Design a protein around this ligand. Structure first.
Ligand SMILES: *CC(=O)N1CCN(S(=O)(=O)c2ccc(OC)cc2)[C@@H](C(=O)NCc2ccc(OC)cc2)C1
Lengths: 247, 251
């Protein structure tokens, strides 16, 4: 309803919807009139024959609503499939230095291409975790930044520690895996014979649960000591970095 | 276009559609609270600290609360700029090592044993396949304390596979609002750190040498961590094949 989150750019990849199971033909415009109620729409693409297309709505909010309202809707004789398109150009930035803001991160990565958003991630106290996100409008810009940031040392502040840039690992902690989408085969039925429950001493489960809990503890040991060598090696190198810059 | 649009799988009046309001004038009233937020539909519990100058109000959907939050933030009221925000969830848990064929519903049924579950989701990757991690948010922190304690002392099994889930406090990260420039104290130290714009270290320069050492250190970390990850993977898949054999040696 005119709603734009402060900072949000419009018609970014994050408000772009995939539309699947379309009926044969469907003019571009028809596609548009389905999404009429959900605001203006930029790019529209329908595929010749394979019955899918993309629509780019204005704000992410507008697209969420349109997503859950139109997902599965029948038209002629088939269920629409409507999901947020996979982002083609989102990057994880690691080891951000201190005094970096969303806007600095954006400015820095602007030299690689047009930036849809950049966010310095903060924990529940508001302190930056050291990771960021950078989403470009096009795959070419993220390829530039990926490549140039591995070959060279990209420095955001005077602190001589370069950020590490890798592709963003896109996880969905919102829709998840509805019971409707679980593969229901023989293994499914085997998993589901018993309901959730606590393993009881003397059962065959209990013996293996304890072995697993022990293994998880053997992983805590190993991993807690790597963390050891790692927090040491970094602190060593960061002192020398800070001392060096004393000039 | 309807107000009560609810993301599928979303209950009403959860912690996730509760907004906090700070910087209130001393003569704020509950009726004023509800009036500020009418428009954003039905309102549930409304609390107002009698004098710490904050309060909070349960809206019905996360969607309405996101619109209220943008519209009401920094609104002046009788001399004060209102600060409107989401709080971090008080009862939000991470579940590790999900067995296969687990759904959001199963995950929620399972954890509803410990208290009222607001939301449960099996995290799915970008090709739709379960990551093995999950989220469970309870309506109140004492439910999540119970789940933590009981899943730690005992072995909680969601299916027939004899692998208990690990349950720990979820690490709430904000990858949406982030760290906006306006929040940053722009003093002497800020400006010294910003002296050099973003740039690539050029060879023959005091940064260049140290950036390289860091890149080497990153590489060394990665290699070390890959050695652990592979050892872990081999050991997990050995015990997991034993578990599977043992579950067939029942069926
Ligand atoms: C807003 C938020 O998510 N918080 C508030 C602070 N806590 S905490 O880590 O300070 C903490 C408070 C209470 C507590 O036990 C009752 C344990 C820790 C946060 C947090 O992570 N809360 C989730 C949580 C943590 C532990 C337990 O049981 C021991 C339950 C729930 C972050």
């Amino acid at each position: 309803k005119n709603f734009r989150k402060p900072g949000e750019k419009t018609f970014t990849q994050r408000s772009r919807l995939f539309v699947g199971n379309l009926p044969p033909d469907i003019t571009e415009e028809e596609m548009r009139k389905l999404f009429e109620k959900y605001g203006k729409a930029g790019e529209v693409f329908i595929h010749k024959d394979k019955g899918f297309g993309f629509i780019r709505l204005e704000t992410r909010t507008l697209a969420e609503i349109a997503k859950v309202e139109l997902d599965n809707m029948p038209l002629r004789g088939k269920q629409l499939r409507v999901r947020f398109a996979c982002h083609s150009a989102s990057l994880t930035v690691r080891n951000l230095p201190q005094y970096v803001s969303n806007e600095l991160l954006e400015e820095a990565f602007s030299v690689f291409g047009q930036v849809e958003r950049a966010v310095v991630i903060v924990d529940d106290r508001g302190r930056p975790s050291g990771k960021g996100i950078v989403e470009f409008s096009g795959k070419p810009a993220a390829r530039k930044a990926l490549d140039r940031c591995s070959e060279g040392s990209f420095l955001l502040t005077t602190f001589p520690r370069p950020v590490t840039v890798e592709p963003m690992d896109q996880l969905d902690d919102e829709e998840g895996l509805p019971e409707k989408l679980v593969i229901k085969n023989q293994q499914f039925h085997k998993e589901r014979e018993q309901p959730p429950r606590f393993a009881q001493p003397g059962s065959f489960e209990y013996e293996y649960a304890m072995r697993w809990k022990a293994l998880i503890e053997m992983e805590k040991q190993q991993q807690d000591q790597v963390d050891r060598n790692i927090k040491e090696a970094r602190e060593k190198l960061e002192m020398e970095m800070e001392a060096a810059r004393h000039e």
